[PDB]
């Protein structure tokens, strides 16, 4: 059971208003045939247009919500809506486009999907809340067949051109008119009571219903993300490398060690309360400090209430006011004043961050992590942590060209003494690169208000 069997049953109740008289007993095989697609028995890597929930989750980067509202089906114009916010009107003669025939509409579909997905995925997964018109309109912009490779590269083919009789991936499809071998999943098959709006609105107040096809397409993908990443969490699903994942993760580790090592040196806290990942290790293993861990998995729904993290039932809680609290990606509602905090900004635009549910986002780097909406009020007791580099390693080169470094934020013995050595200048530039990478990925750093880098200079006495 790797793929979805075409002989699986498809509940057709959601399809009977657009398709009155639809048989109650229906397989994917018959539905695909009814949609105009002839599979001709093909063992070539594309066994079904429809996929399982498990396969949809593994391909979350490919998700595109799709809804079709029948404005007036071959007689009446259809409004095509995508979770990109695009609305295309197709005539058979929140970006709203005027009524145009299918031959030109299909060119716009290929362009939009290619520009949206070329850096995210090797495919498209149309996420539906199927009522009928969306499935029967697919034949107007979709071609299917054996799995293929791009005419210009080795990537999987996602588009086909009737003008050149050629196939292309999302990167080489300019001017192509057909979506080739797409995937699709119907959320309505998962067993919901009531319509799309009522189920979506139970978990999200950010997507309204301005009564356009894109509003439903956005709500559909959002409800799917809630089901697969908010109420259900699977951190064992490994995701491919599509960008700066490795550099970002390495930068996070370097920044964490730097900031924690410096706060401990500057304010000599006797104890550190490490609140977050149950699998975390000491980021500063040489520090004197009493290191105490508290397990709290990444919250995918709402940010943790600081009160419930301290909630100890019939026993006493550990004192948090003693020493410093470290919250490295531990999303809470309001941090204590004695904290070192790394909070992901869900609003960041990137290929790793996908739109999520109720203001939150789905950060996909090796694993998928739905993160609750970034809330500036969480940090009222803290200040933004300024960039600085700290080093107490000996001034020794060991060796890339060089230009003299002049920086007030290079906290080293050599800078104190009047001139940064080449080694600390190379390490400062590498650290600043890592720092910028982590900030640009969407992470924000916060610290207790008494934090002052001036206190680091006296560690060179
Ligand atoms: C010092 O900072 C923290 C941070 C987070 C949690 C605790 C704590 O003591 N929690 C606790 C204790 C006994 C039973 C259940 C619990 F959740 C202390
Ligand atoms: Zn290509
Ligand atoms: Zn939503
Ligand atoms: Zn130096």
Coordinates of C-alpha atoms and ligand atoms in Angstrom, one line a residue:
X1 CA 0.0 0.0 0.0
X2 CA 2.4 2.7 -1.2
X3 CA 0.0 4.5 -3.5
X4 CA -3.9 5.0 -3.4
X5 CA -5.7 2.2 -5.3
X6 CA -7.9 3.3 -8.1
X7 CA -10.5 0.8 -6.9
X8 CA -10.8 2.7 -3.5
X9 CA -14.3 4.1 -2.9
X10 CA -14.9 7.8 -3.3
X11 CA -17.8 9.3 -1.3
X12 CA -19.8 11.3 -3.9
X13 CA -22.3 13.1 -1.6
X14 CA -20.2 16.3 -1.9
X15 CA -20.4 16.1 -5.7
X16 CA -24.3 15.7 -6.1
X17 CA -25.3 19.4 -6.3
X18 CA -23.0 20.1 -9.3
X19 CA -23.6 16.5 -10.5
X20 CA -27.2 15.5 -9.7
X21 CA -27.7 11.8 -10.1
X22 CA -24.1 10.8 -9.3
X23 CA -23.9 7.1 -8.2
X24 CA -23.4 6.7 -4.4
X25 CA -21.1 3.7 -5.1
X26 CA -18.1 5.1 -7.0
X27 CA -14.4 4.2 -7.3
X28 CA -11.5 6.5 -8.2
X29 CA -11.3 4.5 -11.5
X30 CA -14.8 5.5 -12.5
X31 CA -14.4 9.1 -11.3
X32 CA -11.2 9.6 -13.3
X33 CA -12.9 8.1 -16.4
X34 CA -15.9 10.5 -15.8
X35 CA -13.3 13.4 -15.6
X36 CA -12.2 12.6 -19.2
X37 CA -9.0 10.7 -18.3
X38 CA -8.2 7.4 -19.9
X39 CA -5.6 5.5 -17.9
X40 CA -5.4 2.6 -20.4
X41 CA -3.8 0.5 -17.7
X42 CA -0.5 2.2 -17.1
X43 CA 2.4 0.9 -14.9
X44 CA 4.6 3.9 -15.5
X45 CA 4.9 5.7 -12.1
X46 CA 1.5 7.5 -12.3
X47 CA -1.1 4.9 -11.0
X48 CA -3.7 7.4 -9.7
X49 CA -4.3 11.2 -10.1
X50 CA -5.5 11.1 -6.4
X51 CA -3.2 10.4 -3.5
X52 CA -3.3 9.2 0.1
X53 CA -3.2 11.6 3.1
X54 CA 0.3 10.2 3.9
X55 CA 1.6 10.9 0.4
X56 CA 0.0 14.4 0.5
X57 CA 1.9 15.2 3.8
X58 CA 5.2 14.0 2.3
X59 CA 4.5 16.5 -0.6
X60 CA 3.1 19.5 1.4
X61 CA 5.4 21.9 -0.6
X62 CA 3.3 21.0 -3.7
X63 CA 0.0 21.9 -2.1
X64 CA -2.2 24.3 -4.2
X65 CA -5.8 24.8 -3.0
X66 CA -8.1 24.7 -6.0
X67 CA -11.8 25.7 -6.2
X68 CA -14.1 26.3 -9.2
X69 CA -17.3 28.2 -8.8
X70 CA -19.8 28.1 -11.7
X71 CA -20.5 31.9 -12.2
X72 CA -23.6 31.4 -14.4
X73 CA -19.8 24.1 -17.4
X74 CA -19.4 24.4 -21.3
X75 CA -22.7 26.6 -21.2
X76 CA -21.7 28.9 -18.4
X77 CA -18.4 30.6 -17.4
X78 CA -16.4 29.1 -14.5
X79 CA -14.4 31.1 -11.9
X80 CA -11.1 29.3 -11.1
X81 CA -9.6 30.1 -7.7
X82 CA -6.2 29.1 -6.4
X83 CA -4.7 29.3 -2.9
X84 CA -2.2 31.9 -4.5
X85 CA -5.1 34.3 -4.4
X86 CA -5.6 34.2 -8.2
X87 CA -9.1 34.1 -9.8
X88 CA -9.3 33.3 -13.5
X89 CA -12.6 33.4 -15.3
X90 CA -12.9 30.8 -18.2
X91 CA -15.6 31.3 -20.9
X92 CA -16.6 28.6 -23.4
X93 CA -17.1 31.1 -26.2
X94 CA -8.0 38.3 -4.3
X95 CA -6.7 39.0 -7.8
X96 CA -9.8 39.0 -10.1
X97 CA -9.1 38.4 -13.8
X98 CA -11.8 38.9 -16.6
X99 CA -13.5 36.1 -18.6
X100 CA -11.2 34.6 -21.3
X101 CA -11.3 31.3 -23.3
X102 CA -9.6 28.1 -22.0
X103 CA -6.7 28.2 -24.6
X104 CA -5.4 31.4 -22.9
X105 CA -6.5 30.6 -19.3
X106 CA -4.4 27.3 -19.4
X107 CA -1.3 29.4 -20.3
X108 CA -1.9 31.5 -17.2
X109 CA -2.3 28.3 -15.0
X110 CA 1.0 26.8 -16.2
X111 CA 2.8 30.2 -15.6
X112 CA 1.3 30.7 -12.1
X113 CA 2.0 27.1 -10.9
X114 CA 5.6 27.1 -12.4
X115 CA 6.4 30.5 -10.7
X116 CA 4.9 29.3 -7.4
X117 CA 6.4 25.8 -7.3
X118 CA 9.7 25.7 -9.2
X119 CA 11.7 26.4 -5.9
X120 CA 9.4 24.3 -3.7
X121 CA 8.6 21.0 -5.3
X122 CA 9.0 18.5 -8.2
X123 CA 5.1 18.4 -8.6
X124 CA 1.7 20.0 -7.9
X125 CA -1.0 18.6 -5.4
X126 CA -4.4 20.2 -6.0
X127 CA -6.1 20.3 -2.6
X128 CA -9.9 20.2 -3.1
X129 CA -13.2 20.4 -1.2
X130 CA -14.8 18.7 -4.2
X131 CA -18.3 19.6 -5.3
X132 CA -18.0 18.7 -9.0
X133 CA -17.0 21.6 -11.3
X134 CA -13.3 21.5 -10.3
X135 CA -12.9 17.8 -11.2
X136 CA -14.8 18.2 -14.6
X137 CA -12.8 21.4 -15.5
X138 CA -9.4 19.6 -15.1
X139 CA -9.6 18.2 -18.7
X140 CA -9.4 21.7 -20.0
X141 CA -5.9 22.4 -18.6
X142 CA -4.5 18.9 -17.7
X143 CA -2.8 16.1 -19.8
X144 CA -1.7 12.8 -18.3
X145 CA 0.5 9.8 -19.3
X146 CA 3.7 8.0 -18.4
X147 CA 6.2 9.7 -16.1
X148 CA 8.6 11.9 -18.1
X149 CA 11.7 14.0 -17.8
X150 CA 12.1 17.7 -18.8
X151 CA 13.3 18.5 -22.3
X152 CA 15.9 21.0 -20.9
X153 CA 17.0 19.1 -17.8
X154 CA 16.8 15.8 -15.8
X155 CA 13.9 17.0 -13.5
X156 CA 10.5 15.3 -13.6
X157 CA 8.1 16.8 -16.2
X158 CA 5.2 18.9 -14.8
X159 CA 4.1 20.7 -18.0
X160 CA 3.4 19.9 -21.7
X161 CA 3.3 22.1 -24.7
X162 CA 0.9 21.4 -27.7
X163 CA 3.0 23.9 -29.8
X164 CA 6.3 22.1 -29.6
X165 CA 5.1 18.5 -28.5
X166 CA 7.6 18.7 -25.6
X167 CA 7.6 18.3 -21.7
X168 CA 9.2 20.5 -19.0
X169 CA 9.7 20.8 -15.3
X170 CA 8.5 24.0 -13.4
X171 CA 11.9 25.7 -14.3
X172 CA 11.8 25.3 -18.1
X173 CA 8.0 25.6 -18.9
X174 CA 7.8 29.2 -20.3
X175 CA 5.1 29.2 -23.0
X176 CA 3.8 25.7 -22.0
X177 CA 0.0 25.3 -22.1
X178 CA -0.8 22.1 -20.1
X179 CA -0.3 20.8 -16.6
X180 CA 1.1 17.4 -17.0
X181 CA 0.6 14.5 -14.5
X182 CA -0.7 16.6 -11.5
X183 CA -1.8 15.1 -8.2
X184 CA -4.9 15.9 -6.2
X185 CA -6.6 15.1 -2.9
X186 CA -10.2 15.7 -1.8
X187 CA -10.3 16.9 1.9
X188 CA -14.1 16.1 1.8
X189 CA -13.0 12.4 1.7
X190 CA -11.6 12.7 5.2
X191 CA -14.9 12.6 7.0
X192 CA -16.1 16.1 7.9
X193 CA -19.7 17.1 9.0
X194 CA -20.9 20.4 7.5
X195 CA -19.5 22.7 4.7
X196 CA -15.9 24.0 4.2
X197 CA -16.5 27.4 5.9
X198 CA -17.8 25.9 9.2
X199 CA -14.9 23.4 9.5
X200 CA -12.2 26.0 8.6
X201 CA -13.6 28.7 10.9
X202 CA -13.4 26.3 13.9
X203 CA -9.6 26.6 13.8
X204 CA -8.9 29.8 11.8
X205 CA -10.0 33.5 12.0
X206 CA -7.4 34.9 9.5
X207 CA -9.0 33.7 6.2
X208 CA -12.4 35.2 5.5
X209 CA -14.9 34.3 2.9
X210 CA -15.1 37.2 0.5
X211 CA -17.3 34.8 -1.6
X212 CA -14.7 34.2 -4.4
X213 CA -13.2 30.9 -5.6
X214 CA -9.7 31.8 -4.2
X215 CA -11.2 32.3 -0.7
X216 CA -12.5 28.7 -0.7
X217 CA -9.1 27.5 -2.2
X218 CA -7.2 29.2 0.6
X219 CA -9.6 27.8 3.3
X220 CA -9.4 24.3 1.8
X221 CA -5.5 24.2 1.9
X222 CA -5.6 25.8 5.4
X223 CA -8.0 23.2 6.8
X224 CA -5.8 20.5 5.2
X225 CA -2.6 22.0 6.9
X226 CA -4.5 22.1 10.3
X227 CA -5.5 18.4 10.0
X228 CA -2.1 17.2 8.8
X229 CA 0.3 19.5 10.8
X230 CA -1.7 21.1 13.7
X231 CA -3.9 18.5 15.2
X232 CA -1.7 15.6 13.9
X233 CA 2.1 15.9 14.2
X234 CA 4.6 13.5 12.5
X235 CA 8.2 14.7 13.0
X236 CA 9.6 11.4 11.5
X237 CA 8.7 12.5 7.9
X238 CA 12.0 13.7 6.3
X239 CA 11.8 16.5 3.7
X240 CA 14.2 17.1 0.8
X241 CA 16.8 19.9 0.7
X242 CA 15.5 22.8 -1.4
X243 CA 17.5 25.8 -0.1
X244 CA 19.9 26.9 2.7
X245 CA 18.7 24.3 5.2
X246 CA 22.1 23.1 6.2
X247 CA 23.7 26.6 6.5
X248 CA 20.6 27.8 8.4
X249 CA 20.8 24.9 10.9
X250 CA 24.6 25.4 11.4
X251 CA 24.1 29.1 11.8
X252 CA 21.4 28.5 14.5
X253 CA 23.9 26.2 16.4
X254 CA 26.8 28.8 16.2
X255 CA 24.4 31.7 17.3
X256 CA 23.0 29.8 20.2
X257 CA 26.4 28.9 21.6
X258 CA 27.7 32.5 21.1
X259 CA 24.7 34.2 22.8
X260 CA 24.4 31.8 25.7
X261 CA 28.2 31.7 26.4
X262 CA 28.2 35.5 26.4
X263 CA 25.2 36.0 28.7
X264 CA 26.7 33.5 31.2
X265 CA 30.1 35.4 31.1
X266 CA 28.5 38.9 31.3
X267 CA 26.0 38.2 34.1
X268 CA 27.5 35.0 35.7
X269 CA 24.1 33.4 36.3
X270 CA 24.3 30.5 38.8
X271 CA 21.6 28.4 37.2
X272 CA 20.1 28.1 33.6
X273 CA 16.5 26.8 33.0
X274 CA 16.6 25.3 29.5
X275 CA 12.9 25.1 28.4
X276 CA 12.1 23.4 25.2
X277 CA 13.1 20.4 23.0
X278 CA 13.2 17.2 25.2
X279 CA 16.2 16.0 23.0
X280 CA 18.3 19.2 23.7
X281 CA 22.0 19.1 24.7
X282 CA 24.0 21.8 26.6
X283 CA 24.9 24.5 24.0
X284 CA 27.8 25.7 26.2
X285 CA 29.2 22.4 27.6
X286 CA 32.2 24.1 29.4
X287 CA 30.1 26.6 31.5
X288 CA 30.2 26.4 35.3
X289 CA 26.3 27.0 35.5
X290 CA 23.8 24.5 36.9
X291 CA 22.1 23.4 33.7
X292 CA 18.5 22.2 34.2
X293 CA 16.2 20.9 31.4
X294 CA 12.4 21.1 31.0
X295 CA 10.8 19.1 28.2
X296 CA 8.2 20.8 25.9
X297 CA 7.8 19.7 22.3
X298 CA 7.3 22.4 19.6
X299 CA 3.7 23.7 19.9
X300 CA 2.0 23.7 16.5
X301 CA -1.4 25.1 17.6
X302 CA -1.3 28.0 20.1
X303 CA 1.8 29.3 21.9
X304 CA 2.4 27.8 25.3
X305 CA 0.9 29.7 28.3
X306 CA 3.9 30.4 30.6
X307 CA 1.6 29.5 33.5
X308 CA 1.0 25.9 32.2
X309 CA 4.7 25.3 31.6
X310 CA 5.2 26.0 35.3
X311 CA 2.1 24.0 36.3
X312 CA 3.4 21.3 38.7
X313 CA 0.1 19.7 39.9
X314 CA 0.4 18.6 43.6
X315 CA 4.1 19.4 43.9
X316 CA 6.1 22.7 43.8
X317 CA 7.5 24.2 40.5
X318 CA 11.2 25.0 40.2
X319 CA 12.1 28.6 40.7
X320 CA 12.5 30.4 37.4
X321 CA 13.5 33.8 38.9
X322 CA 16.8 32.2 39.9
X323 CA 19.4 32.6 37.1
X324 CA 18.3 32.7 33.4
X325 CA 15.7 31.0 31.3
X326 CA 16.6 29.8 27.8
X327 CA 13.8 29.5 25.3
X328 CA 15.4 28.3 22.0
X329 CA 12.4 28.0 19.6
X330 CA 10.1 27.4 22.6
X331 CA 7.0 29.6 21.6
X332 CA 5.4 31.0 24.8
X333 CA 2.7 33.7 25.2
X334 CA 4.8 36.1 27.4
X335 CA 8.4 35.4 28.3
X336 CA 9.8 36.1 31.8
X337 CA 12.2 39.1 32.1
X338 CA 15.3 36.8 32.8
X339 CA 15.2 35.1 29.4
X340 CA 17.3 34.4 26.3
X341 CA 14.9 33.8 23.4
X342 CA 14.9 32.6 19.8
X343 CA 11.4 33.0 18.3
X344 CA 10.7 32.1 14.6
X345 CA 8.8 35.0 12.7
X346 CA 6.0 33.3 10.9
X347 CA 5.6 36.3 8.6
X348 CA 9.0 35.7 6.9
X349 CA 8.8 35.2 3.0
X350 CA 11.0 32.2 2.0
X351 CA 11.0 28.8 0.3
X352 CA 11.2 27.0 3.7
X353 CA 8.2 28.8 5.2
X354 CA 4.7 28.0 3.8
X355 CA 1.4 29.7 4.7
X356 CA -0.3 28.1 7.7
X357 CA -3.4 28.1 9.9
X358 CA -4.8 31.0 12.0
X359 CA -1.8 33.3 11.3
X360 CA 0.8 30.6 11.9
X361 CA 3.2 29.2 9.3
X362 CA 4.5 25.7 8.2
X363 CA 8.3 25.8 8.5
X364 CA 9.8 22.9 6.5
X365 CA 13.5 22.3 7.1
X366 CA 14.3 18.5 7.3
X367 CA 10.9 18.2 9.3
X368 CA 7.6 20.1 9.0
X369 CA 6.9 22.4 12.0
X370 CA 3.6 24.4 12.1
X371 CA 4.5 27.5 14.2
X372 CA 1.9 29.7 15.9
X373 CA 1.6 33.3 14.7
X374 CA 4.4 35.7 15.6
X375 CA 3.1 38.1 18.3
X376 CA 5.3 41.1 19.3
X377 CA 3.6 41.3 22.7
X378 CA 5.2 38.0 23.8
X379 CA 8.5 40.0 24.2
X380 CA 7.4 43.0 26.3
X381 CA 9.8 42.0 29.3
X382 CA 12.8 41.7 26.9
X383 CA 14.7 43.8 24.3
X384 CA 16.0 42.8 20.8
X385 CA 19.4 41.2 21.1
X386 CA 22.0 43.2 19.2
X387 CA 24.6 41.5 16.9
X388 CA 28.0 41.0 18.5
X389 CA 30.9 38.5 18.1
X390 CA 32.7 37.2 21.2
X391 CA 35.9 35.2 21.4
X392 CA 38.4 34.3 24.0
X393 CA 40.4 31.9 21.7
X394 CA 44.1 32.6 21.3
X395 CA 45.2 35.1 18.6
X396 CA 46.7 32.6 16.2
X397 CA 46.0 32.5 12.4
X398 CA 46.5 28.8 11.2
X399 CA 46.3 28.9 7.4
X400 CA 41.2 33.2 1.4
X401 CA 42.6 36.8 1.3
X402 CA 42.3 39.7 3.9
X403 CA 41.3 43.4 4.5
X404 CA 41.8 44.9 8.0
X405 CA 38.7 44.6 10.2
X406 CA 37.4 47.6 12.1
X407 CA 34.4 46.8 14.3
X408 CA 33.1 48.0 17.6
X409 CA 31.2 44.6 17.9
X410 CA 34.2 42.3 17.6
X411 CA 34.7 41.5 21.3
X412 CA 38.2 40.0 21.3
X413 CA 41.6 40.6 23.2
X414 CA 43.1 42.0 19.9
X415 CA 40.3 44.5 19.4
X416 CA 40.7 45.6 23.1
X417 CA 44.5 45.9 22.5
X418 CA 43.9 48.1 19.4
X419 CA 43.8 46.0 16.3
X420 CA 41.9 42.8 15.3
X421 CA 44.2 39.9 14.3
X422 CA 43.5 38.0 11.0
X423 CA 42.1 34.9 12.8
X424 CA 39.4 36.8 14.8
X425 CA 38.6 38.9 11.6
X426 CA 38.0 35.7 9.6
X427 CA 35.9 34.2 12.4
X428 CA 34.0 37.6 12.9
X429 CA 33.1 37.7 9.2
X430 CA 32.1 34.0 9.2
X431 CA 30.0 34.6 12.3
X432 CA 28.3 37.6 10.8
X433 CA 27.5 35.6 7.7
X434 CA 25.9 32.8 9.8
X435 CA 24.1 35.4 11.9
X436 CA 22.6 37.1 8.8
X437 CA 21.6 33.8 7.4
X438 CA 19.7 32.8 10.5
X439 CA 17.9 36.3 10.8
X440 CA 17.0 36.2 7.0
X441 CA 15.6 32.6 7.5
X442 CA 13.1 34.3 9.9
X443 CA 14.5 33.7 13.4
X444 CA 14.4 36.7 15.9
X445 CA 16.6 37.0 19.0
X446 CA 15.5 38.6 22.3
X447 CA 17.3 39.0 25.6
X448 CA 16.8 40.3 29.2
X449 CA 17.1 44.1 29.4
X450 CA 20.3 44.2 31.6
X451 CA 22.3 42.4 28.9
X452 CA 25.3 44.6 27.9
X453 CA 28.3 43.5 25.8
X454 CA 30.5 46.1 27.7
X455 CA 30.6 43.5 30.5
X456 CA 32.4 41.0 28.1
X457 CA 35.6 43.2 27.8
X458 CA 36.6 42.5 31.5
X459 CA 36.8 38.8 30.7
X460 CA 40.3 39.8 29.1
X461 CA 41.9 40.9 32.4
Ligands
LIG1 C1 12.5 26.9 36.2 O1 11.7 27.1 35.0 C2 10.8 26.1 34.7 C3 10.3 26.1 33.4 C4 9.4 25.1 33.0 C5 8.9 24.2 34.0 C6 9.3 24.3 35.3 C7 8.8 23.3 36.3 O2 9.3 23.2 37.4 N1 7.8 22.5 35.9 C8 7.2 21.3 36.5 C9 7.7 20.9 37.8 C10 7.1 19.7 38.3 C11 6.1 19.0 37.6 C12 5.7 19.5 36.4 C13 6.3 20.6 35.9 F1 5.8 21.1 34.7 C14 10.3 25.2 35.7
LIG2 ZN1 13.7 21.4 -16.7
LIG3 ZN1 -7.4 29.5 7.5
LIG4 ZN1 42.7 38.1 17.9

